């Protein structure tokens, strides 16, 4: 479990299932203990509805339609998959991910 | 190029969660190990002073004293009359007045019919109104413990649900805030012990190849340091006092626990630490506290201000009976750049910890003389804090929240939660 | 829920602004869709726009420049506006009621014609 | 654009007339079929290809194969006479297509 | 033809739910989701749903989460056990206006005190309504059916507004008609995430600071001739009422166990005057004859209607119950509901008497000992309703008249929850079309 | 949600603009109401990827329309019925074809595809 | 050949769950229990393991205590009391039995005490050294049960959870283990009745073909033997003892339900049986017996042995009084190679430790008049110690219920599974 | 539900669909029959997470491009499909049940993500 923290991101990408795994699982305690359990479902079933709104409900490597805008990042294919981790990757593509996810379900539902 | 989605990605932000026990065998057993793996090439910035696992454990640890409370007797009737006298037996000059022998009309377990009853109270435990009554009576009643009840410290775990992990600072020289480039993750954390004390850290975790020194701000004289010892320094404390228990039917099916007749001499409780031993342990103190403070400071160690009993001297729990030491033969010394120190101890019975009012119990009385060692592995301590004229700086013994001893136990945890969804660009398309 | 007869300026001048209301009778406006369709003088249908009152409108591109289309349920009608008016765009205007199914194949069909307004571009 | 259609013609009564629509842009998308005559608005005869309007005779018809449609009138009447129009929605281009109309007379 | 599968499709029924807290923000409003920034409301155009204020369930709902928070609340609290005793009472006058006597009684008593060998004998000022002789020997009225858990200090009855929120696949369906009844079909309907706020307010006869009717009076009733069932009237523009306790009491504290402390009443500080609320005369005449005019509508515009008092009953329901700041004010509405009408500055001044032991709910064995409140209370409120009963049939007359009834505190809610109804969202659907594998 | 903005409108109406990018006691209560959430939504989850339509808002099936169900019009139900109205009208049915399309095309196609 | 993946396969293993009762902390039940058999099944169930048992213990528990939660503590009562002999038409037997007890009791103030007197059974007051106690003043006062609150058993239903299944074996002969060629999978167990009895099983099943003989290990003289029956017995038990209940108000709100004086003659509770049906019965067990000891060996039933009244007496609730009747009259006879009534003589006790829980009892109050009530004996626990003895056995409460779900066992249900086939992805 | 137990292996792949309807459906029998529906959940869901891993998506029949190791059972199809149920595959499988799913996680699935 999240050994790869350190590799690249190509070295990272063959480890997914693991991580996949591991996010499902007086009377006080019993309920902080149960709404865990709920949240942690709902988190999944609520990141699953956006795997499934961009077309690959089932995969656990998805590759679309949408064109790489240059705005974000503007670096090599080599860099960013053989010198980087992807701790790396999510502070530098951070503030913009609210807007991939945009088109990234246009160019899912209305394209096909 | 086009966008990729990974689900599975190893990235993962600071978060704010519950975890729950894994008190091995309200709480479940552990695995066979709790299996760690080094992340390697990870630099992950810590922070013991915003972590919520200590304010976690805080509330957990009171919650589960007070459920060990709910099924327990509630002294109602104790709050009476109490006629005293001195106890004026083969005393010594240290424990003149101290103990009382109290006469008191008690409820027997049929309604109508009361008994005459004598025990033996603390003076601690008793205010004047020869007429005296018991401290609590004018907050509230309190919660005698079920005698069966033990106050040792168990080791408990804190796991983190699925979609969170918690991450341990392996850096040695990690002082507590900032980047930490030896990281593991951990299904949970190692056996942690709830052990309560003020001013002295007992029987915890010890540091490697130095003493290491923990402070929000070194500069601000208002954040207690923590101070994590290399070696232990061991105390040994005693209650010379052979004692014997009396049960007194209080009610039906309710038992109060009184000290009877102490059979022998009464002398002072008392623990002893080693001269040699804590002049070494303040010598690396000194050491390590001059790289903070200038090579050029004079470091004065003196006892503490003032107030409460419970914050003015170091309170602890020997062996089922709760010790008040009057910690001011350890911290008197002067520093500039085979013996036995002895504490004299009170005892109280009558107790209100964490601060709370309204909610007191009573710890029954235990038989015979109790012995108990322990590690000293740490202090908490507070700077003095006057002007920069002196080249002379002071430190006095804290002992303020409780949270405190569990930061210097959970102080290489931070919990994080895992988000998994990870766009990068890649060939692929379609 | 057939339309009235529609309302409209009679003659628009050159660059000119067109405005044509559509009432419905026997009915709510916001069942269907609606649209506009233009025949010209010699005889061709020019389908100009379409919308249903939630907001979903279909214009055509040839026009989206100058078309402005809307509802009013209130008062049960509908509003086009054909801005800089050219000599081509002198026609019969009809206000359609329409179907629409749509399953896997999206479909449309122009169920009640209206009379029409007839425009003429002139000065 | 305008889709293709049968240039304007005549029948003899009783026969039949067959009018077709066609174009690239056409495909498998559902032809309505329309009239026009003097006096009136257009209406609505024939929907999906094949769906007879309210107050459509059995005598019209329609159908679809390939990029062609086409409306089948049987047993013409002088009642017939008028222009008719194939209309189609286009998706991909979000356009309505209408046909460009061909004028049905009767002869006799 | 082929069935095709249709998942979004707009279709609800009639459901019943477990709708939740919302808040704006010492009550139970902390543990209740809180509001978001602005309210969601959608108009379903042309659809018309049926309604009835008359069989809903968030009614019934809200009651049990009221006497639920209710008791949650008086339950930390301390319970007055000790105070079932014998106490000796001596009446009060000193500074008696001719119409507060007998009202207040002075009774000494022997209460338990911090240790439990010793008594101390203490005093406190009771009122008339919350003793009982038992033959100058009195006891608290309590004291033969249940022990009083008194309210702590610290809590506040004010009532917060509270919204219900359907949870997720649920809705809530607004009728925006000005002119509906309360059953039968709205013809303007929005669906809403949230309710509006509902103040949880507590009264008997006069419907106070509740939401006011648009352009016209409204009568609401299940069975208009039925005369068991309740008329609800909602008034369009409120009728401003004021309610004050003139006498200036003082709190005491007796320590009667441990961390126990009873409130009493110490000796007030100036005259003994009788708490009364003022209602304008001229206001309440012209909502009165409002009233009227829409009460003919349902009886014929040649009958007289007549307004009459109470008939009977205990004191909450022949009196306009309510607490006004702490204080539990029981109010003689007898000037209010004293007219005929036939076919065509000054004040009004209701007595009112105060009650410290309060059996709300009309729950026995469950009582509530409200601490006094120090000082002088006045509180300004707003009629905008009432709850009326015709009596009988008095058949072949021309004669209608009517008296102010308590009923439920149902009927409270029912005229905030009325426009509003629970469905249950289908998804799912499935419709033919021409469609194949 | 607040999609319902549409529930006057007919079903042809509808089905279109549906295309367009679509302390311990308390604590029981929202805990029983998104646990049953999850289940619901679980539920037509499920239902539909037994139908095989998992992912497909609208989807067709192979089940034809019996002839003792609507029996009324195809130009009409879509021009002069509004879902409502359909659910009304259908409602006592939707149990038979649920079964038809769980049985149907699902169980008897996924067999057949390596049969 | 190649893997392929199934969902939905019909398998199971032996699963732990917590099931949901559903009557007619319950919630309402189904129209009918749908029992789907299933062909060519063979299932092996385990009566002695199922804890499907050991959890209808917890609820039933559980369900009596919070039952007991709002009503009235007796705290009070715990006082010195005054106590004579009850004379007046005392009867040769019951004598000493009943006491005439005075006492001084709280009221509603707190300052006024009232002197009240009660009839007290010999079985709940012990003497302090005239004056008396009740017994449980040494070990905890207790609460009284509500009059309004029945004690009337009203059927459980268990339900399987989602993902589980309950199967019940159909078997006409089951031993209690083993296989069961005839298994059916049932959504909600049938109406099981929580009667609460010692030695005698009251109101249960009955065997349908002949009398049935279930122990874990029949060898082993230790575990118990649990007898079923094709037929029932009829017992009639009854307390000709019309007697009055007074209300004493002991506080606020609170009221002590307490034995007035008794109208007539004092006569002792007892439960008749026929003699004729126990014997055949009695014979058609040692039959059963015979299968499993042989058919040469001597029967003898001797009456219990010893230990406290609830385990040594056939202790039941007869209309709200709790009744503890000695069987010794039952279980006295030897069978070597091969009208009239028996008369029982039952105690009425009124402070109740049930199901051996030490520190909580209940005090039953008096029910007014005569009480009568019928029921039916439908088996036995018995206990062994080349003659064989057996005794009435009083073991846990568990084995009452054991008899009922003997034919129950809960499973968890797999959906996946792999299965070779000729097919490539 | 279940009716298919003791009927044979292929006759009981007709009703995979029944089975799977079943699967999902005081304040302390709330809680404890409310860790019942959340485990009854969570579990369904953990199944579908271990299908959707192996390529099975949201199918009910698959078809795995991993081979049928010949070291398992050595029967021929006609009887695992013919003379036996669903129970005694299970029973017969046993243990080589862990290897099977690692080989659908990772021979397959992985090496053809990786692949493609
Ligand atoms: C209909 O609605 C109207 C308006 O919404 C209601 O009228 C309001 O009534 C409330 C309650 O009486 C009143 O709030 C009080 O106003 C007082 C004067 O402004 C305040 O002094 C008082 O504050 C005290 O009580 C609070 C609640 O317990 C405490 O939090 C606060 O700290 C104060 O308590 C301290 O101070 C007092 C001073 O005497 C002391 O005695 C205490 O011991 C303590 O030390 C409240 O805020 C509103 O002001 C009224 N609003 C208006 C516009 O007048 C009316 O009651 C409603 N009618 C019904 C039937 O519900
Ligand atoms: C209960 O009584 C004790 C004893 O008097 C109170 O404690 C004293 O409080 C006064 C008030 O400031 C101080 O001056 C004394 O020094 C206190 N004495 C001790 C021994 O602490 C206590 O405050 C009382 N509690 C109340 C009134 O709630
Ligand atoms: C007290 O009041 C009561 C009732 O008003 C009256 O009967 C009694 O005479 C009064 N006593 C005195 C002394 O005023
Ligand atoms: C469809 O179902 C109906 C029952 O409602 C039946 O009468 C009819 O024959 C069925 N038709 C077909 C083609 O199955
Ligand atoms: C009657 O009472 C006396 C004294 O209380 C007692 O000794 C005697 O045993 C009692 N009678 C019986 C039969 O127990
Ligand atoms: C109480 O006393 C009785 C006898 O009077 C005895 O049997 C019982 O064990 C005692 N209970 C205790 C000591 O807890
Ligand atoms: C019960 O019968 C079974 C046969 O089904 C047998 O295996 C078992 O040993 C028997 N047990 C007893 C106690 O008789
Ligand atoms: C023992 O006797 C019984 C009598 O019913 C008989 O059935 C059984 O076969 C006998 N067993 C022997 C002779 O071994």
């Known amino acids: 479990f999240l050994g790869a923290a350190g590799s690249t991101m190509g070295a990272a990408s063959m480890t997914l299932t693991v991580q996949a795994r591991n996010l499902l699982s007086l009377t006080v305690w019993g309920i902080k203990q149960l709404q865990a359990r709920v949240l942690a479902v709902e988190r999944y079933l609520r990141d699953q509805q956006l795997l499934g709104i961009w077309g690959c409900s089932g995969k656990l490597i998805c590759c679309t339609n949408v064109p790489w805008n240059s705005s974000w990042s503007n670096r090599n294919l080599s860099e960013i998959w053989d010198n980087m981790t992807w701790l790396q990757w999510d502070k530098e593509i951070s503030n913009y991910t609210q807007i991939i996810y945009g088109l990234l379900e246009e160019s899912q539902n209305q394209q096909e | 190029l086009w966008v990729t989605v990974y689900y599975g990605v190893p990235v993962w932000k600071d978060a704010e969660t519950t975890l729950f026990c894994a008190s091995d065998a309200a709480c479940v057993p552990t695995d066979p190990n709790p299996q760690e793996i080094h992340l390697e090439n990870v630099t992950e910035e810590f922070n013991m002073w915003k972590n919520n696992m200590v304010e976690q454990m805080h509330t957990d640890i009171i919650s589960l004293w007070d459920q060990s409370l709910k099924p327990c007797v509630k002294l109602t009737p104790l709050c009476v009359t109490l006629q005293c006298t001195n106890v004026t037996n083969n005393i010594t000059d240290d424990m003149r007045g101290e103990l009382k022998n109290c006469s008191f009309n008690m409820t027997t377990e049929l309604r109508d019919k009361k008994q005459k009853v004598y025990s033996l109270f603390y003076r601690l435990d008793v205010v004047q109104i020869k007429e005296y009554r018991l401290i609590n009576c004018n907050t509230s009643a309190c919660t005698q413990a079920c005698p069966k009840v033990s106050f040792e410290p168990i080791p408990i775990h804190y796991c983190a649900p699925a979609g969170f992990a918690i991450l341990k600072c392996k850096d040695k020289k990690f002082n507590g805030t900032g980047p930490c480039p030896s990281v593991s993750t951990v299904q949970c954390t190692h056996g942690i012990k709830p052990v309560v004390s003020t001013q002295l850290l007992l029987n915890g975790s010890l540091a490697e190849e130095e003493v290491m020194i923990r402070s929000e701000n070194i500069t601000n004289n208002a954040k207690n340091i923590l101070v994590q010892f290399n070696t232990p320094v061991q105390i040994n404390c005693t209650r010379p006092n052979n004692n014997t228990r009396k049960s007194i039917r209080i009610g039906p099916g309710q038992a109060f626990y009184a000290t009877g007749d102490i059979i022998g001499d009464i002398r002072q409780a008392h623990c002893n630490v080693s001269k040699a031993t804590w002049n070494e342990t303040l010598g690396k103190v000194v050491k390590q506290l001059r790289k903070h403070f200038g090579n050029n400071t004079i470091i004065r160690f003196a006892n503490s201000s003032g107030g409460d009993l419970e914050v003015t001297t170091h309170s602890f729990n020997c062996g089922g009976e709760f010790f008040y030491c009057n910690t001011s033969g350890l911290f008197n010394s002067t520093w500039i750049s085979n013996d036995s120190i002895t504490l004299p101890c009170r005892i109280k019975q009558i107790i209100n910890m964490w601060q709370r009012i309204g909610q007191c119990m009573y710890a029954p009385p235990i038989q015979g003389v109790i012995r108990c060692v322990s590690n000293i592995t740490g202090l908490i301590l507070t700077r003095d804090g006057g002007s920069t004229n002196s080249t002379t700086e002071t430190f006095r013994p804290g002992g303020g929240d409780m949270r405190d001893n569990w930061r210097s136990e959970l102080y290489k945890y931070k919990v994080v939660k895992i988000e998994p969804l990870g766009v990068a660009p890649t060939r692929c398309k379609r | 829920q057939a339309p009235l007869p529609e309302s409209g300026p009679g003659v628009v001048r050159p660059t000119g602004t067109l405005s044509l209301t559509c009432t419905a009778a026997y009915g709510s406006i916001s069942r269907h869709f609606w649209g506009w369709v233009r025949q010209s003088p010699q005889g061709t249908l020019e389908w100009i726009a379409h919308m249903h009152h939630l907001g979903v409108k279909y214009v055509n591109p040839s026009l989206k420049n100058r078309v402005s289309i809307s509802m009013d349920t209130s008062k049960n009608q509908m509003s086009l506006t054909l801005k800089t008016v050219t000599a081509t765009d002198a026609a019969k205007y009809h206000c359609?009621?329409?179907?629409?199914?749509?399953?896997?194949?999206?479909?449309?069909?122009?169920?009640?014609w209206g009379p029409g307004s007839l425009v003429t571009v002139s000065s | 654009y305008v889709l293709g259609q049968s240039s304007s013609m005549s029948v003899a009564p009783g026969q039949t007339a067959k009018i077709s629509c066609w174009g690239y842009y056409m495909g498998t998308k559902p032809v309505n079929w329309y009239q026009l005559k003097p006096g009136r608005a257009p209406s609505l005869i024939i929907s999906y290809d094949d769906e007879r309007a309210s107050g459509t005779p059995a005598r019209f018809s329609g159908s679809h194969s390939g990029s062609t449609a086409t409306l089948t009138i049987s047993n013409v009447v002088p009642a017939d006479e008028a222009d008719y129009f194939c209309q189609v929605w286009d998706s991909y281009y979000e356009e309505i297509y209408f046909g460009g109309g061909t004028a049905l007379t009767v002869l006799g | 033809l082929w069935v095709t599968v249709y998942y979004g499709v707009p279709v609800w029924k009639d459901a019943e739910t477990t709708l939740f807290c919302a808040s704006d923000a010492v009550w139970a409003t902390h543990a209740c989701v809180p509001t978001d920034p602005n309210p969601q409301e959608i108009h379903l155009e042309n659809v018309t749903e049926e309604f009835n204020m008359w069989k809903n369930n968030m009614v019934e709902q809200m009651h049990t989460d009221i006497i639920s928070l209710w008791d949650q609340s008086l339950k930390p609290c301390v319970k007055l056990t000790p105070l079932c005793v014998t106490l000796q009472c001596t009446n009060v006058t000193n500074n008696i206006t001719d119409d507060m006597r007998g009202e207040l009684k002075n009774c000494s008593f022997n209460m338990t005190t911090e240790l439990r060998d010793k008594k101390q004998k203490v005093y406190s000022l009771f009122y008339r309504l919350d003793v009982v002789q038992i033959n100058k020997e009195y006891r608290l009225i309590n004291c033969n059916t249940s022990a009083c858990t008194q309210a702590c200090p610290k809590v506040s009855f004010e009532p917060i507004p509270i919204h219900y929120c359907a949870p997720a696949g649920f809705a809530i369906l607004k009728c925006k008609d000005k002119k509906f009844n309360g059953t039968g079909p709205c013809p303007s309907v929005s669906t809403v995430q949230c309710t509006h706020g509902i103040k949880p307010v507590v009264s008997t006869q006069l419907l106070l600071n509740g939401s006011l009717a648009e352009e016209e009076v409204m009568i609401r009733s299940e069975n208009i001739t039925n005369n068991a069932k309740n008329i609800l009237v909602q008034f369009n523009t409120p009728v401003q009422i004021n309610c004050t306790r003139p006498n200036n009491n003082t709190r005491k504290s007796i320590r009667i166990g441990p961390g126990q402390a009873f409130y009493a009443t110490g000796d007030i500080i100036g005259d003994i005057r009788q708490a009364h609320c003022n209602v304008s005369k001229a206001t309440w005449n012209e909502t009165l004859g409002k009233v009227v005019k829409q009460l003919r509508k349902h009886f014929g515009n040649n009958t007289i209607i007549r307004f009459a008092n109470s008939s009977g009953g205990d004191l909450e329901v022949t009196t306009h119950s309510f607490n006004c700041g702490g204080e539990f004010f029981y109010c003689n509405t007898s000037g209010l509901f004293n007219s005929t009408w036939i076919s065509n500055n000054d004040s009004i001044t209701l007595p009112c008497r105060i009650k410290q032991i309060i059996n709300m709910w009309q729950r026995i064995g469950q009582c509530m000992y409200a601490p006094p409140i120090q000082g002088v209370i006045r509180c300004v409120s707003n009629i905008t309703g009432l709850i009326l009963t015709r009596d009988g049939g008095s058949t072949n007359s021309t004669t209608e008249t009517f008296r102010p009834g308590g009923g439920d505190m149902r009927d409270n809610w029912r005229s905030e929850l009325y426009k509003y109804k629970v469905v249950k969202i289908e998804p799912l659907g499935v419709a033919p079309t021409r469609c194949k594998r | 949600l607040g999609f319902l903005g549409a529930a006057g409108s007919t079903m042809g109406a509808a089905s279109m603009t549906l295309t367009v990018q679509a302390l311990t006691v308390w604590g029981i209560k929202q805990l029983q109401a998104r646990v049953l959430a999850v289940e619901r939504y679980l539920r037509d989850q499920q239902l539909l990827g037994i139908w095989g339509c998992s992912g497909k808002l609208i989807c067709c099936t192979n089940v034809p329309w019996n002839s003792s169900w609507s029996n009324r019009n195809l130009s009409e139900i879509w021009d002069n019925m509004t879902w409502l109205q359909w659910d009304k009208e259908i409602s006592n049915y939707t149990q038979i074809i649920y079964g038809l399309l769980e049985e149907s095309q699902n169980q008897q196609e996924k067999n057949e595809q390596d049969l | 050949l190649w893997v392929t993946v199934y969902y939905g396969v019909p398998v199971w293993k032996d699963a732990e769950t917590t099931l949901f009762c559903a009557s007619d902390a319950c919630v309402p039940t189904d129209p009918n229990p749908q029992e789907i058999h299933l062909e060519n099944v063979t299932e092996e169930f385990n009566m002695w393991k199922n804890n499907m048992v050991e959890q209808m213990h917890t609820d039933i528990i559980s369900l009596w205590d919070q039952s007991l939660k709002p009503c009235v503590k007796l705290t009070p009562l715990c006082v010195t009391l005054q106590c004579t002999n009850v004379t007046n038409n005392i009867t040769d037997d019951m004598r000493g039995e009943l006491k005439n007890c005075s006492f001084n009791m709280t009221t509603e103030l707190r300052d006024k005490k009232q002197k009240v007197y009660s009839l007290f059974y010999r079985l709940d007051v012990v003497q302090i050294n005239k004056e008396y106690r009740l017994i449980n003043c040494n070990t905890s006062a207790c609460t009284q049960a509500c009059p309004k609150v029945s004690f009337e058993p009203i059927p459980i239903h268990y339900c399987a959870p989602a993902g589980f299944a309950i199967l019940k074996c159909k078997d006409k002969k089951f031993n209690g283990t083993g296989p069961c060629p005839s298994v059916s999978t049932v959504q909600c167990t049938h109406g099981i009745k929580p009667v609460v009895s010692t030695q005698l099983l009251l109101n249960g099943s009955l065997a349908e073909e002949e009398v049935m003989i279930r122990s874990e290990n029949i060898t082993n003289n230790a575990k118990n033997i649990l007898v079923q029956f094709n037929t029932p017995v009829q017992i009639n038990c009854t307390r000709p003892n019309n007697n009055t209940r007074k209300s004493i108000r002991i506080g606020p709100g609170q009221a002590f339900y307490a034995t007035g004086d008794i109208i007539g003659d004092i006569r002792q509770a007892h439960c008749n049986v026929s003699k004729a049906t126990w014997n055949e019965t009695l014979g058609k067990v040692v039959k059963q017996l015979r299968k499993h000891f042989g058919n040469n060996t001597i029967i003898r039933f001797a009456n219990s042995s010893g230990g406290d009244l609830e385990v040594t007496t056939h202790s039941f609730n007869c209309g709200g009084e709790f009744f503890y009747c000695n069987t010794s009259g039952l279980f006295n006879s030897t069978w070597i190679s091969n009208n009239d009534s028996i008369t029982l003589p039952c105690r009425i006790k009124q402070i109740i430790n049930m199901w051996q829980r030490i520190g909580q009892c209940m005090y039953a109050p008096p029910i007014q008049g005569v009480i009568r009530c019928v029921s039916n004996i439908t088996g036995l626990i018995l206990t062994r110690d080349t003659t064989e003895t057996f005794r009435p056995g009083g073991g846990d409460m568990r084995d009452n219920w054991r008899s009922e779900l003997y034919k129950y066992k809960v499973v968890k249900i797999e959906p996946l599974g792999v299965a070779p086939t000729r097919c490539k992805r | 539900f279940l009716g298919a137990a003791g009927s044979t292996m292929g006759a009981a792949s007709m009703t995979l669909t029944v089975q799977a309807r079943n699967l999902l459906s005081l304040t302390v029998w709330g809680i404890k029959q409310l860790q019942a529906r959340v485990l009854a959940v969570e579990r369904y869901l953990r199944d579908q997470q271990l299908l959707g891993i192996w390529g099975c998506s949201g199918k009910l029949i698959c078809c795995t491009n991993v081979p049928w190791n010949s070291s398992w059972s050595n029967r021929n199809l006609s009887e695992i499909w013919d003379n036996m149920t669903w129970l005694q595959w299970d029973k017969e499988i046993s243990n080589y049940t862990q290897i099977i799913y690692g080989l659908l996680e990772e021979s397959q699935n992985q090496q053809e993500k990786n692949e493609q």
């Open positions: 359609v009621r329409m179907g629409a199914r749509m399953s896997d194949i999206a479909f449309f069909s122009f169920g009640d």
